[PDB]
Amino acid sequence: EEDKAYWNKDAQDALDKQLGIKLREKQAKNVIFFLGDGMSLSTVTAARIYKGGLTGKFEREKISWEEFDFAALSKTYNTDKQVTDSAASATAYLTGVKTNQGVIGLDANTVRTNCSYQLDESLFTYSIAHWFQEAGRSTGVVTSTRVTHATPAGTYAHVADRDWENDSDVVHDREDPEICDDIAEQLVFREPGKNFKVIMGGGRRGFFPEEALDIEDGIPGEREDGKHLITDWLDDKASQGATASYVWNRDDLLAVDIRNTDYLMGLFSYTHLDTVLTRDAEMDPTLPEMTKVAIEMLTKDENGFFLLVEGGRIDHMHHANQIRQSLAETLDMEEAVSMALSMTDPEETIILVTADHGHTLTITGYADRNTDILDFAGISDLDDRRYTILDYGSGPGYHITEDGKRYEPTEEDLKDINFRYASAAPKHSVTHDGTDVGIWVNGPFAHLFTGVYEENYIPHALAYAACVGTGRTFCD
Amino acid sequence: EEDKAYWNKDAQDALDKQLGIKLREKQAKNVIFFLGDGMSLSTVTAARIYKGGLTGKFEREKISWEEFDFAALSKTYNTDKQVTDSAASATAYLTGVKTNQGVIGLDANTVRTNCSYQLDESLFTYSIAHWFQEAGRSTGVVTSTRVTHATPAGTYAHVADRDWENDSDVVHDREDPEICDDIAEQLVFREPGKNFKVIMGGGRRGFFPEEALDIEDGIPGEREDGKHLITDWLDDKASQGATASYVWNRDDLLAVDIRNTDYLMGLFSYTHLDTVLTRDAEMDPTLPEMTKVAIEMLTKDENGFFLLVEGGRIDHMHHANQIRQSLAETLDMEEAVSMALSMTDPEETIILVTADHGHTLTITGYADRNTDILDFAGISDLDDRRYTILDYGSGPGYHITEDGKRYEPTEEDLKDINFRYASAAPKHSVTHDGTDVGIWVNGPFAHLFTGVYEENYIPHALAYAACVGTGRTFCD
Ligand SMILES: *[C@@H]1O[C@H](CO)[C@@H](O)[C@H](O)[C@H]1NC(C)=O
Ligand SMILES: *[C@@H]1O[C@H](CO)[C@@H](O)[C@H](O)[C@H]1NC(C)=O
Ligand SMILES: [Zn+2]
Ligand SMILES: [Zn+2]
Ligand SMILES: [Zn+2]
Ligand SMILES: [Zn+2]
Ligand SMILES: [Zn+2]
Ligand SMILES: [Zn+2]
């Protein structure tokens, strides 16, 4: 068992590993950036124990990126709020500049929801994907959310409001769609989006009009301007002489001919992809599966590539206090990191994992070792009712019963994938959490991430290592 | 303002600092270890903002130790519980071995509360202080709690139950005080305690009997065996031919003759020292003040010293969900770190800050930048009542009013130093939080702390750098 000699050996071996670390002071050819949306440090710890329950290692289990030698902390406050949204943070960790709540790819002069600001090129911030393109290297994005969602949008878009995924959202805020480009338009018509070799995720709805119907579901599109952007995207590649494929299910994705495919657009859902615990495994590719094809495509570029992969529905589950699903989305991303590591050369590939912001998840005591992380922790000594190990500072989990008592979770509740674990402050959708989040890095110049940094530091360091952009560079 | 150019420069300057880092691969003469008891990463974020509210820098403020270049995470699960207590964690980050809940300086074979296990030397784990003393170096402890509390007890005691601070606690568990040494006895009669050059904190009560009265308060002591351990401590130093001083208030501490004082015992309270916001500043020394004198005394030793400093009441305030006080305790420690840095040479002194475990504090949205961290965040969209930025996953803050609604905090509540901010799961004392905590390190071999580690790793690394102990060593 876990006795003196055991813990002494465990520590000495970790010390030996630490002392055996070798710095990689050489250029990064590739950068793969994983983003766990709303994946607080507490989400990681919880997810680790969750994984341990599946492997029988429990609290001794390790998350794949926890094998990396470099971890760091990231300060997420933005230019007008203590607790950032996904838009302003993505602007920060992908374009290197912090900005206001709800804004993407514009600096803090921007007044949210006022489109004029997205017409002023002087306020634009440029993404690490843009910088890779300027250096003549390939780029792509993979996510479990609509591909027009704030996080992936950070790599290409410039909007005064992140809600403007399609033209109908622009119209809804009474701005002029003709001149106010929505995110979906920017992805297909403007740089850097129009040059991405790989685009995968959900959100088909934003790419064709109300008069047209969704492949798969036959749901009317959301566009109100008659544009069929998927066909525009395809026509465009064809006119360049390149080969392009649009797929919308797993079988077709897995069937794509890697060697002969220049551009790949894979949209697997009308909106966000189905959560891990609800998806049809036959029809939807998993995050690791999307990740692997992305890397196969982008890696054909002998000068390198940048790829963003987002485990995005971690956040959505947390907003509903649906912690069981949140942990399942997190492990899907954890497995995609293992997939990426198994396919790339660490002497030339940076793999970085971080979160945009956290969520108010906490891990209460005092269950025994090996207890299922989603289980009860004990019984309150104030009201004599059960309470769970996991709970929230914020969200719809707060529940006062009809007869005026604290809602007591049951066994059935715990297994219910839609059960909302208790919060301290009721809100229809949980707020994010302002606590610093983690960064974990492997590959060239991973040692640029050792201490505590502003969230916008990230891409400046990455550009230095990759030799892209107009900042200081390893190749300078 | 915080515009593009401003964030670009901010990031480039942080990059320039990172690239300028120089590794210190030399022996550590001194090691100063700060322990924020119960100081979760969320506590550190919140304290940072709390500090900013005092200085006018707000979210852009920095915690002193956040200036260190090396930060890491620490996994705090122990041998029987997911969420550790202060006893088993101190055994881990001070003796290098994880152990069971409530046990100090004995391995996991120990059945808590059963004294027999504290008679078996084979089960003993030895502290970093013990290692320093075996190498011929000085040691000391400083804390805001009773000096017999679990945290400082980790540097010297071996007990089957951390409650055994004095003999009356042993008796209370129906063990035999004659053979079961309480922690106060071990501090004064056994090694390594008996050799500490400096001992500061509270807890006088455990050092003299019921028949005797406290200096200052005249409160009867807790001992039931007639022992006057303070006089035993003094007699003992005198008989070695050394000069010793016992002080119990701030003037006397500050009046101590550093050059001619070999041993210093400073007990400033009957129990735990008064919290920051309640203490009489005339009668009680602050954490930084205790820290400075400790350093002044220990640093006379040309071969080096180890010093533990604990910001201990951080925890106690969080148990009561008294977040305002918790933050104030935290900054007292933050200031002590700055004191220690100003006093020592980083080419030869390691300064390391960490926490034993966290608490279930979360930071909710969405207050504007510059809002006081202790203020309201907004109004719930479910019950139309205010909620605070800060709240808890666990504790006594949970409050259902008489008419069966969520308690709505008022302005007066916020200002009240004893107001308990809301929790999600009511409990008389909040539980600790199982989430990984931070480590931040400066000086020689600070770069042994880059990634994610088991909590017991810490002292093994520190021993290697200081060249003490029987593990692998820089000097080997
Ligand atoms: C939008 O911005 C422009 C200025 O560049 C301004 O004239 C207009 O009034 C703004 N709209 C609002 C409602 O703030
Ligand atoms: C305490 O430990 C001893 C020694 O091995 C054993 O004889 C005894 O019954 C234990 N006490 C209890 C109550 O378990
Ligand atoms: Zn987000
Ligand atoms: Zn996202
Ligand atoms: Zn969110
Ligand atoms: Zn503690
Ligand atoms: Zn303590
Ligand atoms: Zn505690």
PDB file of N, CA, C and O in Angstrom, chain A residues 41-42 73 433-438 452, chain B residues 38-48 65-66 72-74 355 357-359 361 363 435-440:
ATOM      1  N   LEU A  41      -9.395  24.920 -12.990  1.00  0.00           N
ATOM      2  CA  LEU A  41      -8.475  24.026 -12.352  1.00  0.00           C
ATOM      3  C   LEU A  41      -9.265  22.987 -11.595  1.00  0.00           C
ATOM      4  O   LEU A  41      -8.897  21.855 -11.633  1.00  0.00           O
ATOM      5  N   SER A  42     -10.366  23.364 -10.949  1.00  0.00           N
ATOM      6  CA  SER A  42     -11.215  22.412 -10.223  1.00  0.00           C
ATOM      7  C   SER A  42     -11.855  21.393 -11.228  1.00  0.00           C
ATOM      8  O   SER A  42     -12.047  20.171 -10.932  1.00  0.00           O
ATOM      9  N   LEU A  73       0.034  29.650 -14.696  1.00  0.00           N
ATOM     10  CA  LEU A  73      -1.254  30.230 -14.375  1.00  0.00           C
ATOM     11  C   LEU A  73      -1.524  31.442 -15.271  1.00  0.00           C
ATOM     12  O   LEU A  73      -0.604  32.187 -15.628  1.00  0.00           O
ATOM     13  N   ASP A 433     -16.206  31.942 -13.803  1.00  0.00           N
ATOM     14  CA  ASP A 433     -15.468  32.123 -12.580  1.00  0.00           C
ATOM     15  C   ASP A 433     -14.214  32.866 -12.910  1.00  0.00           C
ATOM     16  O   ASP A 433     -13.539  32.533 -13.892  1.00  0.00           O
ATOM     17  N   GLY A 434     -13.851  33.818 -12.045  1.00  0.00           N
ATOM     18  CA  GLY A 434     -12.769  34.720 -12.330  1.00  0.00           C
ATOM     19  C   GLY A 434     -11.409  34.264 -11.907  1.00  0.00           C
ATOM     20  O   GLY A 434     -10.423  34.958 -12.152  1.00  0.00           O
ATOM     21  N   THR A 435     -11.356  33.116 -11.254  1.00  0.00           N
ATOM     22  CA  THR A 435     -10.088  32.575 -10.772  1.00  0.00           C
ATOM     23  C   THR A 435      -9.136  32.293 -11.918  1.00  0.00           C
ATOM     24  O   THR A 435      -9.564  31.873 -12.983  1.00  0.00           O
ATOM     25  N   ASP A 436      -7.845  32.500 -11.689  1.00  0.00           N
ATOM     26  CA  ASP A 436      -6.822  32.100 -12.650  1.00  0.00           C
ATOM     27  C   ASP A 436      -6.985  30.662 -13.134  1.00  0.00           C
ATOM     28  O   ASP A 436      -7.426  29.822 -12.387  1.00  0.00           O
ATOM     29  N   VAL A 437      -6.626  30.387 -14.383  1.00  0.00           N
ATOM     30  CA  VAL A 437      -6.745  29.055 -14.952  1.00  0.00           C
ATOM     31  C   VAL A 437      -5.367  28.581 -15.301  1.00  0.00           C
ATOM     32  O   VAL A 437      -4.378  29.354 -15.249  1.00  0.00           O
ATOM     33  N   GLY A 438      -5.272  27.313 -15.634  1.00  0.00           N
ATOM     34  CA  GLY A 438      -4.000  26.698 -15.969  1.00  0.00           C
ATOM     35  C   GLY A 438      -3.592  26.766 -17.418  1.00  0.00           C
ATOM     36  O   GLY A 438      -4.419  26.929 -18.308  1.00  0.00           O
ATOM     37  N   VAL A 452       3.403  32.977 -13.685  1.00  0.00           N
ATOM     38  CA  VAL A 452       2.099  33.534 -13.715  1.00  0.00           C
ATOM     39  C   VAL A 452       2.047  34.673 -14.778  1.00  0.00           C
ATOM     40  O   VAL A 452       2.892  35.581 -14.741  1.00  0.00           O
TER      41      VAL A 452
ATOM     42  N   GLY B  38      -5.183  26.736   3.728  1.00  0.00           N
ATOM     43  CA  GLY B  38      -6.455  26.895   3.090  1.00  0.00           C
ATOM     44  C   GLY B  38      -6.514  27.944   1.994  1.00  0.00           C
ATOM     45  O   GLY B  38      -7.600  28.306   1.546  1.00  0.00           O
ATOM     46  N   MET B  39      -5.371  28.348   1.479  1.00  0.00           N
ATOM     47  CA  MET B  39      -5.335  29.406   0.482  1.00  0.00           C
ATOM     48  C   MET B  39      -5.420  28.830  -0.923  1.00  0.00           C
ATOM     49  O   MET B  39      -4.378  28.596  -1.519  1.00  0.00           O
ATOM     50  N   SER B  40      -6.639  28.605  -1.429  1.00  0.00           N
ATOM     51  CA  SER B  40      -6.867  28.176  -2.754  1.00  0.00           C
ATOM     52  C   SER B  40      -6.397  29.225  -3.762  1.00  0.00           C
ATOM     53  O   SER B  40      -6.123  30.384  -3.404  1.00  0.00           O
ATOM     54  N   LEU B  41      -6.266  28.784  -5.015  1.00  0.00           N
ATOM     55  CA  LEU B  41      -5.927  29.662  -6.104  1.00  0.00           C
ATOM     56  C   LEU B  41      -6.983  30.735  -6.190  1.00  0.00           C
ATOM     57  O   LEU B  41      -6.654  31.888  -6.428  1.00  0.00           O
ATOM     58  N   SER B  42      -8.252  30.403  -5.918  1.00  0.00           N
ATOM     59  CA  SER B  42      -9.259  31.438  -5.934  1.00  0.00           C
ATOM     60  C   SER B  42      -9.016  32.477  -4.789  1.00  0.00           C
ATOM     61  O   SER B  42      -9.232  33.723  -4.933  1.00  0.00           O
ATOM     62  N   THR B  43      -8.592  31.995  -3.629  1.00  0.00           N
ATOM     63  CA  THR B  43      -8.172  32.907  -2.587  1.00  0.00           C
ATOM     64  C   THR B  43      -7.076  33.819  -3.077  1.00  0.00           C
ATOM     65  O   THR B  43      -7.088  34.973  -2.766  1.00  0.00           O
ATOM     66  N   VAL B  44      -6.101  33.313  -3.808  1.00  0.00           N
ATOM     67  CA  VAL B  44      -4.996  34.178  -4.275  1.00  0.00           C
ATOM     68  C   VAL B  44      -5.491  35.240  -5.321  1.00  0.00           C
ATOM     69  O   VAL B  44      -5.094  36.445  -5.263  1.00  0.00           O
ATOM     70  N   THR B  45      -6.425  34.832  -6.191  1.00  0.00           N
ATOM     71  CA  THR B  45      -6.975  35.755  -7.176  1.00  0.00           C
ATOM     72  C   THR B  45      -7.754  36.802  -6.457  1.00  0.00           C
ATOM     73  O   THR B  45      -7.605  38.022  -6.739  1.00  0.00           O
ATOM     74  N   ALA B  46      -8.614  36.373  -5.554  1.00  0.00           N
ATOM     75  CA  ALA B  46      -9.417  37.292  -4.782  1.00  0.00           C
ATOM     76  C   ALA B  46      -8.553  38.199  -3.939  1.00  0.00           C
ATOM     77  O   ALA B  46      -8.832  39.420  -3.881  1.00  0.00           O
ATOM     78  N   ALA B  47      -7.506  37.665  -3.306  1.00  0.00           N
ATOM     79  CA  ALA B  47      -6.672  38.526  -2.512  1.00  0.00           C
ATOM     80  C   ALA B  47      -5.956  39.570  -3.389  1.00  0.00           C
ATOM     81  O   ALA B  47      -5.754  40.709  -2.961  1.00  0.00           O
ATOM     82  N   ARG B  48      -5.557  39.171  -4.586  1.00  0.00           N
ATOM     83  CA  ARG B  48      -4.871  40.062  -5.489  1.00  0.00           C
ATOM     84  C   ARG B  48      -5.766  41.286  -5.741  1.00  0.00           C
ATOM     85  O   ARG B  48      -5.331  42.458  -5.642  1.00  0.00           O
ATOM     86  N   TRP B  65       4.327  37.161  -4.445  1.00  0.00           N
ATOM     87  CA  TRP B  65       5.019  35.945  -4.906  1.00  0.00           C
ATOM     88  C   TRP B  65       4.732  35.653  -6.368  1.00  0.00           C
ATOM     89  O   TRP B  65       5.400  34.838  -6.979  1.00  0.00           O
ATOM     90  N   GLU B  66       3.760  36.346  -6.934  1.00  0.00           N
ATOM     91  CA  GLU B  66       3.446  36.204  -8.356  1.00  0.00           C
ATOM     92  C   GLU B  66       4.554  36.871  -9.163  1.00  0.00           C
ATOM     93  O   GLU B  66       4.618  36.810 -10.341  1.00  0.00           O
ATOM     94  N   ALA B  72       3.766  26.234  -9.774  1.00  0.00           N
ATOM     95  CA  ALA B  72       3.434  24.847 -10.094  1.00  0.00           C
ATOM     96  C   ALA B  72       2.155  24.514  -9.383  1.00  0.00           C
ATOM     97  O   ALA B  72       1.636  25.298  -8.610  1.00  0.00           O
ATOM     98  N   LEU B  73       1.612  23.356  -9.704  1.00  0.00           N
ATOM     99  CA  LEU B  73       0.420  22.906  -9.049  1.00  0.00           C
ATOM    100  C   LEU B  73       0.749  21.708  -8.153  1.00  0.00           C
ATOM    101  O   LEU B  73       1.605  20.908  -8.494  1.00  0.00           O
ATOM    102  N   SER B  74      -0.055  21.533  -7.109  1.00  0.00           N
ATOM    103  CA  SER B  74       0.105  20.537  -6.091  1.00  0.00           C
ATOM    104  C   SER B  74      -1.187  19.731  -5.835  1.00  0.00           C
ATOM    105  O   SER B  74      -2.269  20.273  -5.552  1.00  0.00           O
ATOM    106  N   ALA B 355       0.103  26.289  -0.401  1.00  0.00           N
ATOM    107  CA  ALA B 355      -0.991  26.029   0.473  1.00  0.00           C
ATOM    108  C   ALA B 355      -1.052  24.557   0.793  1.00  0.00           C
ATOM    109  O   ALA B 355      -0.590  23.734   0.015  1.00  0.00           O
ATOM    110  N   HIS B 357      -4.023  22.919   1.369  1.00  0.00           N
ATOM    111  CA  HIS B 357      -5.224  22.496   0.673  1.00  0.00           C
ATOM    112  C   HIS B 357      -5.956  23.825   0.377  1.00  0.00           C
ATOM    113  O   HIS B 357      -5.637  24.877   0.970  1.00  0.00           O
ATOM    114  N   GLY B 358      -7.001  23.781  -0.437  1.00  0.00           N
ATOM    115  CA  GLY B 358      -7.768  25.008  -0.631  1.00  0.00           C
ATOM    116  C   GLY B 358      -9.054  25.022   0.149  1.00  0.00           C
ATOM    117  O   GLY B 358      -9.290  24.214   1.037  1.00  0.00           O
ATOM    118  N   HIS B 359      -9.889  25.956  -0.217  1.00  0.00           N
ATOM    119  CA  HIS B 359     -11.237  26.081   0.286  1.00  0.00           C
ATOM    120  C   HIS B 359     -12.177  26.292  -0.907  1.00  0.00           C
ATOM    121  O   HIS B 359     -11.707  26.607  -1.975  1.00  0.00           O
ATOM    122  N   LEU B 361     -13.948  28.522  -2.218  1.00  0.00           N
ATOM    123  CA  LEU B 361     -14.230  29.897  -2.623  1.00  0.00           C
ATOM    124  C   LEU B 361     -14.333  29.991  -4.127  1.00  0.00           C
ATOM    125  O   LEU B 361     -13.498  29.406  -4.836  1.00  0.00           O
ATOM    126  N   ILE B 363     -15.429  32.923  -7.515  1.00  0.00           N
ATOM    127  CA  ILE B 363     -15.492  34.319  -7.904  1.00  0.00           C
ATOM    128  C   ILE B 363     -16.457  34.426  -9.087  1.00  0.00           C
ATOM    129  O   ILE B 363     -16.094  34.127 -10.238  1.00  0.00           O
ATOM    130  N   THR B 435      -9.380  20.716  -4.811  1.00  0.00           N
ATOM    131  CA  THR B 435      -8.742  21.174  -6.023  1.00  0.00           C
ATOM    132  C   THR B 435      -7.253  21.367  -5.822  1.00  0.00           C
ATOM    133  O   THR B 435      -6.824  21.779  -4.738  1.00  0.00           O
ATOM    134  N   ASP B 436      -6.448  21.053  -6.814  1.00  0.00           N
ATOM    135  CA  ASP B 436      -5.045  21.395  -6.726  1.00  0.00           C
ATOM    136  C   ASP B 436      -4.764  22.892  -6.290  1.00  0.00           C
ATOM    137  O   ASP B 436      -5.537  23.791  -6.592  1.00  0.00           O
ATOM    138  N   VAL B 437      -3.678  23.137  -5.566  1.00  0.00           N
ATOM    139  CA  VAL B 437      -3.268  24.473  -5.122  1.00  0.00           C
ATOM    140  C   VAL B 437      -1.964  24.859  -5.809  1.00  0.00           C
ATOM    141  O   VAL B 437      -1.289  24.030  -6.435  1.00  0.00           O
ATOM    142  N   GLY B 438      -1.648  26.129  -5.758  1.00  0.00           N
ATOM    143  CA  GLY B 438      -0.405  26.624  -6.306  1.00  0.00           C
ATOM    144  C   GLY B 438       0.828  26.511  -5.441  1.00  0.00           C
ATOM    145  O   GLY B 438       0.753  26.383  -4.214  1.00  0.00           O
ATOM    146  N   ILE B 439       1.967  26.513  -6.130  1.00  0.00           N
ATOM    147  CA  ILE B 439       3.281  26.629  -5.500  1.00  0.00           C
ATOM    148  C   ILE B 439       3.968  27.708  -6.315  1.00  0.00           C
ATOM    149  O   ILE B 439       3.833  27.740  -7.537  1.00  0.00           O
ATOM    150  N   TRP B 440       4.718  28.569  -5.631  1.00  0.00           N
ATOM    151  CA  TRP B 440       5.490  29.600  -6.279  1.00  0.00           C
ATOM    152  C   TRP B 440       6.844  29.644  -5.613  1.00  0.00           C
ATOM    153  O   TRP B 440       6.942  29.736  -4.397  1.00  0.00           O
TER     154      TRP B 440
END
